[PDB]
């Protein structure tokens, strides 16, 4: 799985998270948010 | 990888498992989701429909 | 796909995108007509969902 | 181990810890309880009908 | 006894928390969530 969201707004609601929010997942009605199972968006660009 | 697109969930059992955070403005267009929005190798969003 | 199709359970674990895992690592070795049964069929449900 | 499933609870006693945290669609199915969700060894979701 | 819900509105939030995510059981009006008296699910599976 790799992260989606039907709408930015929870978008927005895991950009706030320092860290470990990608990892979650959220559905709020029909939207969704797939999680990301292995975080490397949080570090592999991050780390940098 | 995949990722979703299009995913429906039953109006009978749909729920709001984040009411304290985000407060969507009513719409018909954000009931149905039309779009995924995702990522790109730089940190981003990127849409598809 | 389905638009009904569950979101919970297919798309956030791990799976074979073709809608039924399956994997000769569990399938019996050497094996074709129960291996293919594995696989193709239906009337015996796959291991995951 | 063990598990009930379509329990009933009093309606007269009803109440709801935590009631911030979550909300649900006046549709009867989110009313009287029906399919209990579990896991797998491996977690995921796994629903009993 | 070990982990049981009606909704996926409350395994959702029993699946977001850290640690301690499985060691109290919310009622919410006839659903109910029915927390594990051991905590295999929250550290065994996944320890290793």
Known sequence: PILSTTTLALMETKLKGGAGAFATSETHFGNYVVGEIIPLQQSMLFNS | ?49 | LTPVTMDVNYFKIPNNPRGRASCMLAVDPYDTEAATKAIYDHREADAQT
């Open chain 2, 1 to 49: 990888f995949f990722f979703p697109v299009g995913l429906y969930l039953p109006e009978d059992r749909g729920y709001t498992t984040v009411e304290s955070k985000v407060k969507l403005n009513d719409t018909v267009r954000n009931a149905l989701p039309t779009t995924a929005y995702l990522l790109n190798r730089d940190r981003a969003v990127q849409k598809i429909d």
